[PDB]
């Protein structure tokens, strides 16, 4: 497929419930939901090597990985983790995460290109799934 592009969010569901699972207190959850409405993703894909830059109004981070190759990033609530991305189908990848220290909820994310030109990201903590939908800029 081709995930490359500059993606702009159009919809975000269940994000507050995800942060609650992760222990974020109420006022910060609401602030973070508002921040997620300016969530933007820039992707450069070459083969199965991905360069991804996620940003909001005041914060930006880049995530670089190769499918099937373990790497280090951070969970949504910011704890460092080791991650491994695999393909689930032609246009969908799934990442499993494992905390480097301590314990916590089981987290993961997915990215999918739809046939309608949308990018769908999900983030999971235990039973709760947040879904975010993007279109190309």
Ligand X SMILES: *C/C=C(C)/C=C/C=C(C)/C=C/C1=C(C)CCCC1(C)C
Contact residues toward ligand X (CB under 6 A) are 32, 35-36, 39, 52, 54, 56, 63, 76, 109, 111, 121
In whole angstroms, the minimum distance from the beta carbon of 39 to ligand X comes to 4
Nearer to ligand X among residue 37 and residue 117 (C-beta): 37
Cβ atoms of 134 and 7 within 8 Å: the answer is: yes
In whole angstroms, the minimum distance from the beta carbon of 117 to ligand X comes to 18
Spatial separation of the C-alpha atoms in residues 55 and 37, rounded to whole Å: 11
Spatial separation of the C-alpha atoms in residues 19 and 74, rounded to whole Å: 14
Burial of 104 (0-12, 13-18, 19+ CB in 10 A): middle
Nearer to ligand X among residue 58 and residue 102 (C-beta): 58
In whole angstroms, the minimum distance from the beta carbon of 131 to ligand X comes to 12
Residue 101, strand partner residues: none
Burial 9-46 (b: 16+ CB within 10 A, else e): beebeebbebbebbebeeeebeebeeebeebbbbbeee
In whole angstroms, the minimum distance from the beta carbon of 58 to ligand X comes to 9
């Amino acid at each position: 497929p081709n995930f490359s592009g500059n993606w702009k969010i159009i919809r975000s569901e269940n994000f507050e419930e995800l942060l609650k699972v992760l222990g974020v207190n109420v006022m910060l959850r609401k602030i973070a939901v508002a921040a997620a409405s300016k969530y933007a993703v820039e992707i450069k894909q070459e083969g199965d090597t991905f360069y991804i830059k996620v940003s909001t109004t005041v914060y930006t981070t880049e995530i670089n990985f190769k499918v099937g190759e373990e790497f280090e990033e951070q969970t949504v609530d910011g704890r460092p983790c080791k991650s491994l991305v695999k393909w689930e189908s032609e246009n969908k990848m799934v990442c499993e995460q494992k905390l480097l220290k301590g314990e916590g909820p089981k987290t993961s994310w997915t990215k999918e290109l739809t046939n309608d030109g949308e990018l769908i990201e999900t983030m999971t903590a235990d039973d709760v799934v947040c879904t975010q939908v993007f279109v190309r800029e």
